[PDB]
A paper describes a structure:
At the membrane distal end of each quaternary complex, HS engages in tripartite interactions with juxtaposed HS binding sites of FGF23, FGFRP and FGFRS. In doing so, HS augments interactions of FGF23 and FGFRP from the FGF23–FGFRP–αKlotho ternary complex with the FGFRS chain, and thus induces receptor (that is, FGFRP–FGFRS) dimerization.
Consistent with the 1:2:1:1 FGF23–FGFR–αKlotho–HS stoichiometry in the cryo-EM structures, size-exclusion chromatography–multi-angle light scattering experiments showed that the FGF23–FGFR1c–αKlotho–HS quaternary complex migrates as a single species with a calculated molecular mass of approximately 220 kDa, which matches closely the theoretical value for a 1:2:1:1 FGF23–FGFR1c–αKlotho–HS (215 kDa). FGF23–HS interactions are mediated by three residues (Arg48, Arg140 and Tyr154) from the atypical HS binding site within the core of FGF23. Compared with FGF23–HS contacts, HS interacts more extensively with HBS in the D2 domains of the two FGFR chains, involving residues Lys177, Lys207, Arg209 and Ser214 of FGFR1cP and Lys175, Lys177, Val208, Arg209 and Thr212 of FGFR1cS. Similarly, markedly fewer fluorescent dots were present on the surface of the L6-FGFR1cWT cell line when cotreated with FGF23ΔHBS and soluble αKlotho. These cell-based data confirm the indispensability of FGF23–HS and FGFR1c–HS contacts in inducing formation of a FGF23–FGFR1c–αKlotho–HS quaternary cell-surface signalling complex. A Cu2+ ion (orange sphere) is coordinated by analogous histidine residues from FGFR1cP and FGFR1cS. However, relative to FGF23ΔNT, FGF23ΔSRBS showed a greater loss in its dimerization/signalling capacity, which implies that the FGF23–FGFRS contacts mediated via the core of the FGF23 contribute more to the overall stability and functionality of the FGF23–FGFR1c–αKlotho–HS quaternary signalling complex than those mediated by FGF23 N terminus.
Author numbering:
A (entry chain A): 34 to 97, 119 to 975
B (entry chain B): 25 to 203
C (entry chain D): 148 to 360
D (entry chain E): 148 to 359
The structure:
Amino acid sequence: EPGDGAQTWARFSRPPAPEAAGLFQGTFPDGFLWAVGSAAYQTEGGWQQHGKGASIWDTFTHHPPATGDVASDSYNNVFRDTEALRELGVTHYRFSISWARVLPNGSAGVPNREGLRYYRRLLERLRELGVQPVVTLYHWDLPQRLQDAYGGWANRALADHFRDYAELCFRHFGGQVKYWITIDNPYVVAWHGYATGRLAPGIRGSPRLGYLVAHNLLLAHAKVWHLYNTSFRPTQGGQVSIALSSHWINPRRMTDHSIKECQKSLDFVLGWFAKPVFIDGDYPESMKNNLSSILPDFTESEKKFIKGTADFFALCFGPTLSFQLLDPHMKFRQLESPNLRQLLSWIDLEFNHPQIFIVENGWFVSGTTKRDDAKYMYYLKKFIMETLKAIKLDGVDVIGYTAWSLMDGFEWHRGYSIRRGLFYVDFLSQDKMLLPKSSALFYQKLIEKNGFPPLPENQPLEGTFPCDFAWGVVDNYIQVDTTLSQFTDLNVYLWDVHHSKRLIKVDGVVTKKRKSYCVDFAAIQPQIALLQEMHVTHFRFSLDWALILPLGNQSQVNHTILQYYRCMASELVRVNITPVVALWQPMAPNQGLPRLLARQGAWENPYTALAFAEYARLCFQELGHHVKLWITMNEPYTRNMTYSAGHNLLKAHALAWHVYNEKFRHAQNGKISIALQADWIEPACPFSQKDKEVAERVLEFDIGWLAEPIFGSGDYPWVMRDWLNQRNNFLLPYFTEDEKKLIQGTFDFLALSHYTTILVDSEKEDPIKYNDYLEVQEMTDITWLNSPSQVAVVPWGLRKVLNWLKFKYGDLPMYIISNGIDDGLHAEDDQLRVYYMQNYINEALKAHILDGINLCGYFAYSFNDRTAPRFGLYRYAADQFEPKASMKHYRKIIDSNGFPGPETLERFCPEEFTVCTECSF
Amino acid sequence: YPNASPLLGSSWGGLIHLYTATARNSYHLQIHKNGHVDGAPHQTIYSALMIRSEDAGFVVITGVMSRRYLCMDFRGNIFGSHYFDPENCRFQHQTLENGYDVYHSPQYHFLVSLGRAKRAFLPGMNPPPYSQFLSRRNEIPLIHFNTPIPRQHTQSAEDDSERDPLNVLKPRARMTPAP
Amino acid sequence: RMPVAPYWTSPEKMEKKLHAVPAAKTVKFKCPSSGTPNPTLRWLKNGKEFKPDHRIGGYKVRYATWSIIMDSVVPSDKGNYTCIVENEYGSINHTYQLDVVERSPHRPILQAGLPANKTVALGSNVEFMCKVYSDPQPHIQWLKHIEVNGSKIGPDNLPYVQILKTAGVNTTDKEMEVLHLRNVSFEDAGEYTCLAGNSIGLSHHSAWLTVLE
Amino acid sequence: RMPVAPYWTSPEKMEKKLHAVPAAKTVKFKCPSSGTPNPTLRWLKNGKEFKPDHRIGGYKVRYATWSIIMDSVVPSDKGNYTCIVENEYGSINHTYQLDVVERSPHRPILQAGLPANKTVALGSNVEFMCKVYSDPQPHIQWLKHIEVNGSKIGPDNLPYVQILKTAGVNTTDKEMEVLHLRNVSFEDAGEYTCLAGNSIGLSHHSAWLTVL
Ligand SMILES: O=C(O)[C@@H]1O[C@@H](O[C@H]2[C@H](O)[C@@H](NS(=O)(=O)O)[C@@H](O)O[C@@H]2COS(=O)(=O)O)[C@H](OS(=O)(=O)O)[C@@H](O)[C@@H]1O[C@H]1O[C@H](COS(=O)(=O)O)[C@@H](O[C@@H]2O[C@@H](C(=O)O)[C@@H](O[C@H]3O[C@H](COS(=O)(=O)O)[C@@H](O[C@@H]4O[C@@H](C(=O)O)[C@@H](O[C@H]5O[C@H](COS(=O)(=O)O)[C@@H](O[C@@H]6O[C@@H](C(=O)O)[C@@H](O[C@H]7O[C@H](COS(=O)(=O)O)[C@@H](O)[C@H](O)[C@H]7NS(=O)(=O)O)[C@H](O)[C@H]6OS(=O)(=O)O)[C@H](O)[C@H]5NS(=O)(=O)O)[C@H](O)[C@H]4OS(=O)(=O)O)[C@H](O)[C@H]3NS(=O)(=O)O)[C@H](O)[C@H]2OS(=O)(=O)O)[C@H](O)[C@H]1NS(=O)(=O)O
Ligand SMILES: [Cu+2]
Ligand SMILES: [Zn+2]
């Protein structure tokens, strides 16, 4: 009933659960209709073959040039269409009888038997393959004789002709066809046919003509449905509906004026035909309180005629109406959304829980796109996932899904600039073969799996990480506050105990200064108390090079900051929390450097490498008695640094590593390596070889650029050098033999920083987002859960990048040196952080146990929210630190040493057996 | 069974709200980010104060969401300030014989008030309205304090002729060279 | 005569949402009404109906001004008090909130035995501890009795002290609870005083640190 | 009309002079007269004219019944409140001695660590201190937890007292602080309390006792 759907934006304003509806999987119901769709003018071709009369699309596209005369040539190619239907595995084929082919001269005249036998041959092929037909009687291809003789749908005398034609179809094909659609998209027929001129006849009359044409469309659909219900539904038992296309709309801001404007938008676009047909025979009163002289009036005989006149709700939610042909005056200053789940809930509420056959759905790609459509495939995946969420999590009665455009064809106002096909059609070819796209293979494997079943590579693992696994947290910006809390006052005072306990200063008498300890630093012990609450084994932090040496060189060593760092380290060892310390990080004002070093080229200068070696020597001298696990560079931005900057950064890493290995390793017995950021790079199409080549290229330009000199062969990776040679980019520097033997082994472990995965595609979808340098379209799966800053939590990419680092560089010790997401609001993004940490630590456990890598640590990103805001495991508000729920869940992961299972007596480690630490040498 | 609450002392270091009242209307002293202090009838996050005594009996009132310091000018009108000015922005506290706190400046002598007629603390002689305070402890959770929380309505490609409304195409920023 | 539904005679006197008083005070809640006939008054504490045996001392419920007068208010009186005034032609209600705040205008009471006397080895770690219970905001100081110039005693009979630790506008309340002494020498041996003070007065607890070996 | 001194209008309602009133109560001194004609009412704080800002809280004068009302009375409000009613034919005086007896606006504050957890070395001369802060001298009960019901509280807060040492106004208040205890072996070793309570509330401090 009209008004039941206005609770939809309140139903979905609450955030969903990540652990429940974020890796929401499941299969579709049995008897779900997996369909693929087609039109007549879009695909058939043969615009005059075998005496087919002129449609109004053979006048709009012949100078009202990219016409639909020979579009996909499906009038002659019945066999390859049905072979694509068979290899797609689809359950139903929605196609459209064209009016002008089977009735060229009219119903006052004999039918054209060749077009009728084409549809008969197509239907008998569909019967051979066992696919069921869903047939649109009218898919915008009205004949030119009716437009010429009566003015088209502006006359109410075509409703008889549409009753006659459909009768012919009901007589000829109704024994095979059990699903009929009278008029596909009466919105755009009425509104861009006779009110905007953008579509089929191109009238550009007025909105008055559009509402009169919609009036006659509703009357003609009612006449055809009553013809079927009276004279064909007894013997045949099919179902007749009308394919209504809707947009989805969202408030500009969540006030009830905006919400009633959104309901007014959906009543003006979709309720225009779905309130007569499904509710009461008459238009929405939102339109009857708005344009009652422009909107024509229904006789109450025509209100009982056009009531209940569809057997199912047929929904079109694709790029036809949504974001393309939606009239902006019908948006009512709101924001349209491509949300099919909220729209299906709106259909379920507003129109009395109907059985919804989503009868056209998909997105598009460009016309320059061959068989690699990753954007179409991920829009189709998101759309099928939203219908599965509507069936499962909303109780919407979706009975079928139709992926639109089996093959590429005409696109009605967008010519051939747009491709919506599942099967690639070369329009310049002669055979016009249906080559399966990426979306065809995806949709075939999804029909075969009947949805999204739980994959065996995503189910959680039971097991424990080894003993001396490094459970750590990071804080890249430690709070360096060198204010001493005690023993700073050196004057001597007089304590009048009795008449007072006021304190009188003995002027001139100053005692001696006590030796400063690090109970004096008041900012240290709160942080360590929060770290002891976390139960972490390791705490990672960076030094500020611009604070130790504020002039670049050793002339002005600030021993106060260095004493603060040394006492942070030693008070962490005092409470059995091992400090991991980064020498340099780019997460800083000017590249993590002193301002004298930052103002001299700053990493292009090789003196920055020599000064980093000397600064690291100072840090190993001072703090090195307590820190036994060093990070040289803390995740350099490989996407935002020059090849010479990375060259001298590798040289600085090797010089600091050799300083530690020669001068400081035997004294202190610690380890030192570099931390590199290793986000996973996955091909967008899982069976495209070009996307695999592109994924390996982005992996060698991202990770392998700085990892291959250190962990690999000592040179830059051959993918990188070969890609830059073939594009005439000789800016990647060459290592001399001395430099190559200097950098080739400068690691004690692998420290990786992993947050997300990026999908990569070889095809240039649009050149604005395309990366012309690496020749890659970066993209994302939009069924993945995201953070408020839109980074995808996708946990198997941690396991995949650990396997890639083992494949590329060998069985090295690997520390996941940083891993976390961010927050945006009250408490629902820490459900996302609990989900993230649970599943990413489980995938690290999978990579350790099942894949056999030597994983030695996991470090949660951002200790607190004071230093790295919205990333922290400690909320920082009102100058207090409150533990979030991810703190407690991560502490439970630490204390269990992983995910142990039903029986657990798992220590088995005296005098530790595993070798990734400082052994007997 | 008895003694169901928290002692009678240990709770002086938490966030409080300075309730004050005259018998028609009741407020909490509220320090805004404007620097304008007023009265909120309920415990607002801008009325949560952190009172720290710098001397024995001389308190300093800050306000933790505003990050200000309750100071007082030369005529009695209190305000907020991001910088602690230790000669006017420090107040001598007293408890009256009825159980209410008063806070007066040591140099200007004026009582901290939320009313108009800002007078001076003479002991035992009828303090001005909204000047007798009472330290109500905090009932707001900490999550309600850090609330910029901006859900970023970015609206990529604001025109509704969009080719990518659901944002599949997600480019990462890089550095391309120029040989 | 007239079936007048009851109304507030003055909603100017009824906009005090929260009554936060010290304990042992008196609180009057008023909700003045009019109407034909005189609509009877009822009070509900925390939803349940408030009768004068639910509270020690009871209350005056005098209807000439439509007020409840609770004398000697106890911290077991907090919560909502709803005035519902009713007759056969209508009923209205108004909810007041009563907070009770216990007030201790005393010197800061220090925890007994803290800080305690400590004998310790050379170069060990000693943490002196004092808990301070003050209903006003106290100032805590950690002093050491200095005997450097001559004897312990100054010009008058007041001992020399040095402020080891003091509470400021940047010092957390937990930070002053404990004085830490790392690697104690023989010079770090003597009297350590936790001196707390508010506007009511000053209290102090002393302890002694002696170093063995 | 008639030059007669203004007389009082209370036969036995104007003879309570000594007002022993608890703190934070409301006092109301009325001196009701009928002038010949309309008289002059004035209130004095033992010698000076009592203007309303001489009381923390102020005071309300009611000319309809000639009554001063001082609500939330303080300990500093003691004195001689004087009502003088004049007219043209002489004047009439009256005094009211207000003596405010005071009470603490809190529970009894027990100093923490009193009493403390002991390690009683096999029947010592053990003593259990409890410092109590209260302006009215409170009721003191100890509640030695005995081994009945098993749990500490079962059916609503067991009355575990068996101690003849109670609170008393006549006996001295200093050495009812300590608990003189005898025969301390393993027949009584559990949880002790210090219940001190007054008109506002009860406060308890818990300590353990262990005989080896
Ligand atoms: O100016 C001003 O002020 C201000 O202004 C403004 O302001 C602000 C502003 O805004 C600005 N501007 S702009 O523009 O810029 O903005 C500026 O200006 O600034 C400002 C500020 O200010 S300031 O403050 O600062 O200055 C504003 O304005 S607006 O408007 O805007 O608002 C404001 O602010 C202001 O103002 C306002 O307000 C105010 C207030 O406010 S607040 O908030 O602050 O608060 C006000 O004011 C106030 O008030 C007034 C009035 O009200 O009036 C005044 O007053 C006072 O006084 C009066 C009186 O006078 S004479 O002279 O006449 O005397 C009062 O009145 C009263 O009231 C009431 C009371 O009481 O209270 C009442 O009474 C009733 O009730 C009772 C009850 O009680 S209970 O108990 O319940 O508690 C009763 O009584 C009772 O009862 C009896 C019987 O029943 O009887 C008895 O009893 C017993 O006994 C018997 C026997 O006896 S023989 O004697 O007879 O033998 C028997 O019978 C019985 O039974 C018994 N009972 S048992 O119990 O035993 O059973 C009892 O006892 C009793 O009780 S007791 O306790 O008492 O003892 C009675 O009765 C009744 N009565 S009847 O008759 O009625 O019924 C009444 O009503 C009355 O009385 S009478 O007598 O008169 O009638 C009052 O209260 C007072 N108040 S206070 O204050 O003190 O509190 C005043 O002056 C004022 O003050 S001030 O400061 O303010 O000034 C107003 O509203 C306004 N103003 S204007 O003018 O301005 O407007
Ligand atoms: Cu007291
Ligand atoms: Zn691809």
